[PDB]
Amino acid sequence: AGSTIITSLQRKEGHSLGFSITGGFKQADGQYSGIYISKIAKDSIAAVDGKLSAGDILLKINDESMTNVPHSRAVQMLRSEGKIITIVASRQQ
């Protein structure tokens, strides 16, 4: 089912984390689609940390599941954290 990628990013005041997300929309079966990293900004905090990749599926932010959640909930959780944020993701070959 892939391999687990885990990193804790440290936000610098004034800055984004450095990646974008897509997904989290309700499907015909009532579940939300997965939330995935769609880009990582060059030279950003996420890029310098280096662990995450575009295409990774987000599984957790800190203690909160990112499975079966709306897009806006994932965005809110990311934007809520002003210093350290733990990202748990999964990546398939």
Binding site: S16, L17, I21, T22, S38, V75, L78
Partner: peptide, 5 residues
């Protein structure tokens, strides 16, 4: 929708 964070 793709969102930068």
């Amino acid at each position: 929708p793709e969102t930068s964070v």
